[PDB]
Amino acid sequence: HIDLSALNPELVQAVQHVVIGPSSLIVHFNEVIGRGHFGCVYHGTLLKKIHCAVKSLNRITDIGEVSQFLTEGIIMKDFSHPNVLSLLGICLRSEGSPLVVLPYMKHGDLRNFIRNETHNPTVKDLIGFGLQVAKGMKYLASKKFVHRDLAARNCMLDEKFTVKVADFGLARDMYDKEYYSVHNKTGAKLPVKWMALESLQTQKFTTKSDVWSFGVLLWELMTRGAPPYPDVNTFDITVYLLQGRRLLQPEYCPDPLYEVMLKCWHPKAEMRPSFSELVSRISAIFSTF
Numbered sequence: 648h649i650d651l652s653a654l655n656p657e658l659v660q661a662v663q664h665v666v667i668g669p670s671s672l673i674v675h676f677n678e679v680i681g682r683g684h685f686g687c688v689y690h691g692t693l694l695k696k697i698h699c700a701v702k703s704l705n706r707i708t709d710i711g712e713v714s715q716f717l718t719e720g721i722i723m724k725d726f727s728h729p730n731v732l733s734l735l736g737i738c739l740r741s742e743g744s745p746l747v748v749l750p751y752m753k754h755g756d757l758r759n760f761i762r763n764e765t766h767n768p769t770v771k772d773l774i775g776f777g778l779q780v781a782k783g784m785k786y787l788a789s790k791k792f793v794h795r796d797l798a799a800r801n802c803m804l805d806e807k808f809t810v811k812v813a814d815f816g817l818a819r820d821m822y823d824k825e826y827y828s829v830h831n832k833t834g835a836k837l838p839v840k841w842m843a844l845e846s847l848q849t850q851k852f853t854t855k856s857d858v859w860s861f862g863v864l865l866w867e868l869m870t871r872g873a874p875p876y877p878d879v880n881t882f883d884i885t886v887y888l889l890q891g892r893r894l895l896q897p898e899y900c901p902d903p904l905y906e907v908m909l910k911c912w913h914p915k916a917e918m919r920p921s922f923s924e925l926v927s928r929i930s931a932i933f934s935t936f
């Protein structure tokens with residue numbers, strides 16, 4: 648049972664902006680639509696019935712950990728952009744950690760979508776998805792928000808095939824454990840094959856390290872969801888990058904788009920493009936299609 652009286656009053660006020668009453672939420676706990684380390688995602692209906700995704704945090708039992716997670720993620724309620732996942736609300740109830748209510752994404756995560764052989768997205772399709780992500784990140788960067796886990800698995804596609812940058816704020820979790828490793832300086836599970844060289848070395852994350860991750864995501868898109876560096880052990884990713892080595896150009900990646908990827912992975916963080924620059928560059932590349 649989570650008591651609001653025990654929680655920081657400032658956090659309580661913030662949360663009370665987006666609270667959903669239990670009687671307004673129906674959750675189908677027999678319908679798992681995603682699985683994270685903090686809890687699963689379930690089909691829900693919000694009430695005018697709205698189809699939604701309900702993210703559990705029930706694996707987080709410590710009040711202090713729940714408090715910290717809410718504190719770090721609540722700013723999500725302040726964001727509004729077509730390429731950024733929105734928050735529908737938070738359901739506080741009698742027993743269990745708060746439920747995070749999110750818009751339902753009919754087409755799931757971007758990586759699974761492009762790996763699906765029946766979909767067979769074209770080069771144009773894939774660059775288009777990449778442009779959408781760049782716009783969402785441009786928005787978050789303008790808000791000084793550092794994502795820290797950008798990757799194709801962490802972007803969702805809605806019913807209109809609009810890409811939402813996701814897995815941040817209250818929606819943050821590890822949804823595919825295979826791509827997080829403890830082989831790094833922090834000893835915690837991190838997406839090391841998406842991380843900028845300086846993040847692996849200094850444990851610090853910035854918008855410019857998000858740009859590095861975006862470069863990897865672009866590579867994911869153009870390979871239709873191939874795993875990066877399949878032949879590089881998690882023990883070796885830092886030295887691999889230190890040696891100046893990088894992901895190779897995908898077969899169906901246009902030369903100018905691979906140039907963009909390489910700029911995203913410049914060893915000097917300040918030498919890498921802003922997301923505003925990336926939107927401009929990728930928009931031009933897309934338009935030639």
Ligand SMILES: OCCn1cc(-c2cnc3nnn(Cc4ccc5ncccc5c4)c3n2)cn1
Pocket residue numbers: 680681682688700702732749750751752753755756759800801802803813814815818819822823
């Ligand atoms: O291999 C991992 C596949 N996978 C990625 C996710 C994922 C990646 N980033 C996310 N950001 N928020 N949410 C929760 C969420 C939000 C909306 C959903 N709509 C339909 C189906 C599942 C949904 C899951 C996210 N889920 C779920 N499964």
